[PDB]
């Protein structure tokens, strides 16, 4: 399942109150950039209305038949390319969200979720971004591991 147009739109529907609105927007922006530098896809922010990729923070039962589970465990989930819920990414509102090494770094989590949003499945490489379990990595000069580049190149490359 892959997107048919190169220019995709996204919307942040709501926020977490543990970080400034600036810092949530920056984490989402930089997460999309990681995939933009390794594919033809171009990502455009909208403020209101219906975008290709809806981003939201939600708790327990939230309308999609995949409920969240409260503190820790499942951190987020994203749907594959398609109409409607296709491509949308949901983040567990009950987590502590950070811009640091402390559980859990919103940039790193969103980076992984957006891979799903674009057609990727999980990787068996423990050093990949698309590995099933969360692991902190120094974020200052973060770029995608080579495994994830191979991933998006096989789809859109
Ligand atoms: Ca959780
Ligand atoms: Ca969508
Ligand atoms: Zn959901
Ligand atoms: Zn995943």
Q: Which helices and strands occur, and which strands form pairs?
A:
Elements: E1 7-12, H1 21-36, E2 42-45, E3 53-58, E4 76-78, E5 89-92, H2 106-117, H3 146-155
Parallel strand pairs: 1-2, 1-3, 3-5
Antiparallel strand pairs: 4-5
Helix pairs in contact: 1-2
The structure holds calcium ion (2 copies) and zinc ion (2 copies).
Residues 68-70, 72-75, 92, 94-95 line the site of one calcium ion.
Structure description:
The structure is a monomer. The chain has one domain: Collagenase (Catalytic Domain), CATH 3.40.390.10. α1 links the parallel β1 and β2. α1 crosses α2. The protein has 157 residues and is α/β, with parallel strands linked by helices. It has a 5-stranded mixed beta sheet, covered by helices on one side. The two termini are 15 Å apart. It contains 3 helices and 5 strands, in the order βαββββαα. Bound molecules: calcium ion (CA) (2 copies) and zinc ion (2 copies). It is classed as hydrolase. Keywords: MMP-8, Matrix Metalloproteinase, hydrolase. The assembly is monomeric. The entry is titled "Uninhibited human MMP-8". The protein: Neutrophil collagenase.
